[PDB]
Amino acid sequence: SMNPPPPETSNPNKPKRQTNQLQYLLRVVLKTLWKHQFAWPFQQPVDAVKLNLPDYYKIIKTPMDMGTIKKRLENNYYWNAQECIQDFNTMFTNCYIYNKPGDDIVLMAEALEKLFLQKINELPTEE
Ligand SMILES: CC[C@@H]1C(=O)N(C)c2cnc(N(C)c3ccc(C(=O)NC4CCN(C)CC4)cc3OC)nc2N1C1CCCC1
Hints:
Layout: H1 20-34, H2 56-59, H3 66-74, H4 81-98, H5 104-120
Helix pairs in contact: 1-3, 1-5, 4-5
This protein binds ligand 6TB.
The ligand CC[C@@H]1C(=O)N(C)c2cnc(N(C)c3ccc(C(=O)NC4CCN(C)CC4)cc3OC)nc2N1C1CCCC1 binds at residues 40-42, 44, 46-47, 50-51, 53, 56, 95, 98-99, 105.
């Protein structure tokens, strides 16, 4: 009946960097997934109130979405590429945990995840 606050995208006391891998995660990985025809459900936090899914944030205790990831990358919120990759994987996994296997939303996440894996396969060596 209420949404939780979204994940943070700024934290001044959290150490952060820009690395060439993090730049790749923004310029190649996020950009590729964001433009995809099936990106739209993943471009912002789940609005469980509008969807009338009061159980969503009972099941999903570590929400993540590409809106959040985009803002984190734009703010250079991360220390390393692994932290950002973890956020994408959390997003996909949440979708697979909550939804019925085979449902259209799962097919959408799978399409995005296939591209994600293809891009991080070519993550550049650091520096
Ligand atoms: C929650 C479980 C499951 C899931 O795992 N995810 C991730 C999921 C996410 N979103 C949606 N839906 C439909 C949305 C899609 C897009 C938007 C969107 O565009 N919002 C924009 C925000 C900014 N404004 C200016 C314009 C509108 C909104 C959404 O819902 C309110 N459905 C999802 N499903 C399922 C798929 C079908 C039944 C629920």
